[PDB]
Homo-oligomer: A and B are copies of this chain.
Amino acid sequence: RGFSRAVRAVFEEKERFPGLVDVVSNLIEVDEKYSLAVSVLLGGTAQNIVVRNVDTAKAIVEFLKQNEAGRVTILPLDLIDGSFNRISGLENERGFVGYAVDLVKFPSDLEVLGGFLFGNSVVVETLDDAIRMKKKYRLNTRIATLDGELISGRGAITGGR
């Protein structure tokens, strides 16, 4: 565990929840190369709890609400959406590294998560590229730089610790 404490409470009573599966960070494999890019791209979702059914999700919510052990985000595989579409041409753009999904691996059946957690979100060399590209294809998608910066699908820029 080492983390969440809200997630911990949830798992150290896993019996109470049938549909339970695992927190994202655990059931995900990311190519060390662009690990940092994916990381910022993920954000808090690295601690999302994946459950099989919504009922178990509500059970957790109600559970935490009682014990007040904190707040969490649950991902019911039966409700979440993993659809997404690539954009023809981005691959030839300058600075273009690749799509999130293509830079991550998920245990066979849990293929959805990729689509869900990322979708068409992309990675690039630098901020300038991200900006310059978001301006072009008026991307409503997310773009993170190898440097660690990020641009929301809506245009919010985050970076530089």
* Chain B residue with Cβ nearest A151: B79
Given A81-B140, A127-B58, A64:B160 Cβ within 8 A:
yes
Q: Does A36 contact B (CB under 8 A)?
A: no
Contacting residues, chain B, for A79 (C-beta < 8 A):
131, 134-135, 155, 157
Q: Does A12 contact B (CB under 8 A)?
A: no
Contacting residues, chain B, for A62 (C-beta < 8 A):
160
User: Could you say how many copies of this chain the assembly holds?
Assistant: 2
CB atoms of B161 and A68 under 8 A apart: yes
- In the bound assembly, the distance between CA atoms of A68 and B152 in angstroms comes to 22
Given A58-B131, A61-B127, A131-B58, A76:B155 Cβ within 8 A:
yes
CB atoms of B127 and A158 under 8 A apart: no
In order of increasing CB-CB distance, the 7 nearest A-B pairs are A71-B160, A65-B160, A61-B159, A64-B160, A80-B155, A68-B161, A73-B158
Q: Taking beta carbons and an 8 Å cutoff, which residues of A are in contact with B?
A: 6, 45, 48, 54, 57-58, 60-65, 68-76, 79-82, 116, 127-128, 131, 134-135, 140, 147, 149, 152, 154-161
